[PDB]
Amino acid sequence: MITAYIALGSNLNTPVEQLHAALKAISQLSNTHLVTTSSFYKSKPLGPQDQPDYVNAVAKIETELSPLKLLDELQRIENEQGRVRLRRWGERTLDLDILLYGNEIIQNERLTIPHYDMHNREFVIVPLFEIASDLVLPNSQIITELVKQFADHKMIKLNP
Amino acid sequence: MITAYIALGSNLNTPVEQLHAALKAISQLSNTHLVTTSSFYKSKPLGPQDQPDYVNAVAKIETELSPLKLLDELQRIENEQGRVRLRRWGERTLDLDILLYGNEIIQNERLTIPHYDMHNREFVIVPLFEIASDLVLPNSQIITELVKQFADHKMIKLNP
Numbered sequence A, B: 001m002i003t004a005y006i007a008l009g010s011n012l013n014t015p016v017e018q019l020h021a022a023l024k025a026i027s028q029l030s031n032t033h034l035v036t037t038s039s040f041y042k043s044k045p046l047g048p049q050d051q052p053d054y055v056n057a058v059a060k061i062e063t064e065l066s067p068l069k070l071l072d073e074l075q076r077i078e079n080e081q082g083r084v085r086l087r088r089w090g091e092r093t094l095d096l097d098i099l100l101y102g103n104e105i106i107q108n109e110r111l112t113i114p115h116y117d118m119h120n121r122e123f124v125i126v127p128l129f130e131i132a133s134d135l136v137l138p139n140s141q142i143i144t145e146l147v148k149q150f151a152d153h154k155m156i157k158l159n160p
């Protein structure tokens, strides 16, 4: 059984509701247990600025699903939740991304684990640090170092 | 002519020389003029940590080549300079990326301009800021703001 980290984001059609629905669906996956979820953070858009602010979170799961089966399931959840994206780098009702799959490094046709650009994203690293305070990444970097860059972030920690 | 910015990176086979050879090739392109280049910066790898530190720079050119014709020329330079890349996110002799092409937003199968993840890389924004401190990005963000996040960077600015 492996510990995986999933990043969630949305800025369209009631973002908080989209995240709650996605978390419920993830929690119901066969051979998967949702361990904990970070707080929801309202963040400034990365991309064109003429779009709504995003609501972001990171969920921790324990699963027996292989990397590609977990991907299939996350894509199924996005599809059944009616995922819509209005433009590249723009508005989307929901995005589910596998940040980490154990300590494995998977870089193939369908997967990029880890995806290092995501470690430069405040709305990914701050929530991850909240639920995995002493995490050491597959490339040997430590979460406490990575979060330094975002110490002065202006994200709003929502409730609920 | 259009003012374009090109990011340069290398961590193999004498990075400093790979960058000098690339800059020379760029300066020699038809309908193109190399205006200035930033200093070269030695930075920690973004990705696996078992690879050498990278040497990075950003160049400002004025060109009449279309976005795709510029891309073809940059890829031809990479090929003619024997570009080698071991694995995804790994070591490479040279990478030339079009960061900005005027104030245009080009998002197709071959181009991603701007590429917002690059705005999160200390090794692109610090040297970009060095040569264009008044830059206003296509999404209207101002470089003076984007660079604040990298104020405490540990990159080594090299001589000359």
Ligand SMILES: CC1(C)Nc2nc(N)[nH]c(=O)c2N=C1O
Pocket (backbone or CB within 6 Å): A008, A009, A010, A043, A044, A045, A046, A047, A053, A054, A055, A056, A088, A089, A090, A095, A123, B116
């Ligand atoms: C377009 C892009 C990069 N911008 C984002 N911006 C923010 N703040 N949060 C996101 O989840 C997010 N996701 C995306 O997919």
Ligand SMILES: CC1(C)Nc2nc(N)[nH]c(=O)c2N=C1O
Pocket (backbone or CB within 6 Å): B008, B009, B010, B043, B044, B045, B046, B047, B054, B055, B056, B088, B089, B090, B095, B123
């Ligand atoms: C693999 C990746 C993202 N890592 C890098 N890391 C650094 N520091 N500099 C780069 O130019 C660079 N280029 C790449 O292509």
